[PDB]
Structures are given as structure tokens and as C-alpha cells.
């Protein structure tokens, strides 16, 4: 009896899923297609193609060979454990532990590769949550959702910084922006962008009347201080002005917002870190470009990046979550992962939806 | 004019030669025409069994 073998059983079935993700058949089919095209006598005569054919080769060789490394590797680890239990070699028991873990460390190498983290997915990011309509019901949902995310990253260890927070009227905000410092911080949060539906009996009306509130959240990364493509001039606009009341221990003890707009395509960012006007406008233009950066990536998806124009515009990830409090049923509209624990996911038990969003993102 | 697309899920695009059938919905303001699913270019619905003459599905060939 060995629970390590019970993990070898678990890792192998997961490996079948890891093979089930990448379409392991077509991986070996395409890799031989790069092989046949390099036999072509004009490899040296097509230089740019040659560096590209090697690029198509080397990118798959780090995956297909690893997939075959996990194939023949696991079969030997399947041998080294069962030989150890049936012969009682204490070192063979000790070595098989390192033999199983390294395969998971290859599964961990596939983990970031399956996540296909590119541009700024390994970097920190910013949040942007807007309140819906209907007075106090919307701002509470703005608040309760935001303060769930604030209690979320603290459990994961991501440093949180409220860049800007604009309180609506009665217990809640209308817009908020939070900087999330962390490794792969954009990677764990990118897929949460969209509109989040709240369904509950409102506490604001006598009787009952289950009310449906809406609120959206927008996650845009940190663009490495410069994208390397500055589209600055672009009808720039500064509007720096005093904010609500600095009452007692109000946010950052600043009340000095820097409202900056990007008139073409209508992008609006703002910052409320410090009293130094020149400091905030420096930080706000950083996120203005980042918000402009996510606009540039959506255009690729708008053509032929990941939409698959088959019949029509296959997408519209606006309604991505539904939070029904009085039925205790949280449903994700992108995968269908459901959970019957409201206060747990109101505390930050969102890993079940991250893996759900990791699949289609 | 603007017309309503019947059935569950459509296969239309920026340019498609459809067929317009009269009929008001009284639920959308201004829509006073329906679109025949299964006509000229607008195809019939998918996986339909009860009322398939409406929405142009032929018949289960099994």
C-alpha cells in the first residue's frame, strides 16, 4: 500500500488530461510536417523561412519531446516504484519519490505552457470595477464584489494598492482601481474581466422584491513602464481636481484625483495615490497606455486571433458570472462550474473558477 | 425595414439573401416582419422536432 502510487495513479490520469489538452495526436502530426519542409533544398535559399521553420521546430520540440519524455519517463517511474515495493530497497523507495516529483515538475513546465502566458501575464496588473444602475443596490454589489477581491489576493499573498476609489453615495463605489503586485498577477486575474450578475432579495425595499444588480470588472496589466510604442499626443487632456472629503481616514489621505482621458476610442483613467500632481499623472498615463494596450489586443481577437469566425461573432464574454445569493448558486457562464458556497467565494475561494477560466483562456 | 429572426440560433451575416415574411411581434418596437428560417440562404434551425415545417427542418432520416 503506497499513497505515492495513489498519486502516480492521479498524475497519470492527469497526464491523460495533459495529453487531452494539447491534442497529442496532432502535436506529433504537425512536428513531422516541420520535418518534411526542412528537407526542401531551398532551406538555405529561403533564409527567413529557415529561421522560422527552425522556430516552428524548436517551439514544438520543447513540447512534443517533453510529451514523449513524460511518456517514457512515467513508464519507468511506474516501474521504479512497483519494483521498490516488491523488493524493499530503501534507496529505491527514496529515489522513486524524486522520480515522481520531477515528472510533476515537467507537468508544472506544461502548466505555464498550457496557460500560454505571453505578453504581460507574468506581470502585475490593475483592477477596474464599475457599479451598475439603480442606486444603492448597485454600489453595494460594487462594494461586496470589490472587497471580495481585496480579501482574495491577501490570502494568495498578492500585494494590494488602491490606485483610485470613487465612492458612490451610500455604502459603495461607482468606480475603483486597484494595483495587484505579484508574480503572474495578471495571469491569475486576466480572465475575470466582464460583467458580474448579482441576484438577491434587496434589503432596501419593504417586503421582498428579489432585485437583479449588475457590475463589471476590468483587468488590465502593467505594460513594463512603456509598450515601446508611444501613442501619447492623441488629444491629451488633464483635469486634476479635488476629491470627496478626506474625512478622518478616507483613502490614501490624498483626495487629489488626476482625471486623464484618451478622446479617440474614449479611454478614461484616473489616479489617487498622492498629493504630488506630477507623480499621479505619471502613474495614470502608465495605466492609460495599458488600458489602451488591452484595446490593441482585443482588435486582434476581433479579426482572427481567438474568435473562430464560423457563423457570426463567436464570443461576447460580458455575462461571465451569476451570483444568486438567495439560492446559494454561483454559476460561471463560460465553463459551467458551479458552487453551493456563497460566503466561501465571497471570502475568495475563486480557484475553482480560475481553472475554469484557465481552460478557455 | 427590420425583421425578426425566428428559431433558436441563426446563421446570418453582414450580407445574406433572406426571405421576409409578414408578422408583428408586439414586443420589439418597430419590428413588423419575420424571417423564414429555411428559405433562400437563411437555413433552418438545428435539432428541431416538434414544429419543423415552421423553421424549415426536413425530417429525421434515421
Amino acid at each position: 500500500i503506497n499513497p505515492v502510487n495513489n498519486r502516480i495513479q492521479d498524475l497519470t490520469e492527469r497526464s491523460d488530461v495533459l495529453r487531452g489538452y494539447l491534442d497529442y495526436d496532432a502535436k506529433k502530426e504537425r512536428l513531422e510536417e516541420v520535418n518534411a519542409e526542412l528537407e526542401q533544398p531551398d532551406v538555405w535559399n529561403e533564409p527567413e523561412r529557415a529561421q522560422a521553420l527552425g522556430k516552428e521546430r524548436s517551439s514544438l520540440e520543447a513540447v512534443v519531446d517533453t510529451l514523449d519524455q513524460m511518456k517514457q519517463g512515467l513508464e519507468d517511474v511506474s516501474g521504479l516504484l512497483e519494483l521498490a515495493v516488491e523488493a524493499d530497497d530503501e534507496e529505491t523507495f527514496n529515489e522513486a519519490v524524486a522520480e515522481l516529483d520531477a515528472l510533476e515538475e515537467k507537468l508544472a513546465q506544461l502548466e505555464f505552457r498550457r496557460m500560454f502566458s505571453g505578453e504581460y501575464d507574468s506581470a502585475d496588473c490593475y483592477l477596474d470595477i464599475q457599479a451598475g444602475s439603480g442606486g444603492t443596490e448597485a454600489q453595494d454589489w460594487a462594494s461586496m464584489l470589490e472587497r471580495m477581491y481585496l480579501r482574495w489576493a491577501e490570502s494568495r499573498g498578492f500585494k494590494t494598492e488602491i490606485i483610485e476609489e470613487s465612492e458612490g453615495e451610500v455604502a459603495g463605489i461607482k468606480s475603483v482601481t486597484i494595483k495587484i503586485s505579484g508574480d503572474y498577477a495578471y495571469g491569475w486575474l486576466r480572465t475575470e474581466t466582464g460583467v458580474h450578475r448579482l441576484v438577491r432579495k434587496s434589503p432596501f425595499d419593504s417586503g421582498g422584491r428579489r432585485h437583479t444588480s449588475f457590475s463589471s470588472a476590468f483587468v488590465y496589466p502593467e505594460v513594463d513602464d512603456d509598450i515601446d510604442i508611444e501613442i501619447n499626443p492623441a488629444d491629451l487632456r488633464i483635469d486634476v481636481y479635488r476629491t470627496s472629503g478626506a474625512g478622518g481616514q478616507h483613502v490614501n489621505r490624498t483626495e487629489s484625483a488626476v482625471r486623464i482621458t484618451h478622446i479617440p476610442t474614449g479611454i478614461v483613467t484616473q489616479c489617487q495615490n498622492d498629493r504630488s500632481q506630477h507623480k499621479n499623472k505619471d502613474q495614470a498615463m502608465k495605466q492609460m497606455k495599458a488600458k489602451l494596450y488591452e484595446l490593441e489586443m482585443q482588435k486582434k481577437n476581433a479579426e482572427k486571433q481567438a474568435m473562430e469566425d464560423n457563423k457570426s461573432d463567436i464570443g461576447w464574454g460580458s455575462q461571465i458570472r451569476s451570483y444568486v445569493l438567495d439560492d446559494s448558486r454561483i454559476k460561471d457562464l463560460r465553463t459551467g462550474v458551479e458552487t453551493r458556497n456563497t460566503q466561501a467565494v465571497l471570502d475568495g475561494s475563486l480557484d475553482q473558477f480560475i481553472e475554469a477560466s484557465l481552460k478557455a483562456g | 425595414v427590420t425583421s425578426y429572426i425566428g428559431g433558436e440560433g441563426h446563421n446570418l451575416q453582414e450580407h445574406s439573401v433572406i426571405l421576409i415574411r409578414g408578422g408583428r411581434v408586439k414586443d420589439l418596437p418597430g419590428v413588423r416582419y419575420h424571417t423564414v428560417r429555411g428559405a433562400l440562404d437563411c437555413s433552418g434551425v438545428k435539432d428541431r422536432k416538434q414544429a419543423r415545417s415552421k423553421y424549415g427542418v426536413k425530417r429525421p432520416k434515421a
Partner: protein, 32 residues
């Protein structure tokens, strides 16, 4: 913003079955 000020995303109020604003003339069926 504009992707939230779409006329879809509006606060939806439900007609409760009993209480304030509960009366129905005939209801879903009128079997006599």
C-alpha cells in the same frame, strides 16, 4: 461604461406573488 450602459444591464424588479403589487386578474390558468 458603454459596455455597461447597454440597455440590457438594467436593475430588474420581480413581481412578487404575494404582498405589495401581487394581484392578478386571472393568472396563468382560468379553468371553469
Amino acid at each position: 461604461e458603454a459596455l455597461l450602459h447597454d440597455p440590457l444591464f438594467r436593475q430588474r424588479v420581480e413581481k412578487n406573488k404575494k404582498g405589495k403589487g401581487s394581484y392578478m386578474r386571472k393568472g396563468k390558468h382560468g379553468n371553469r
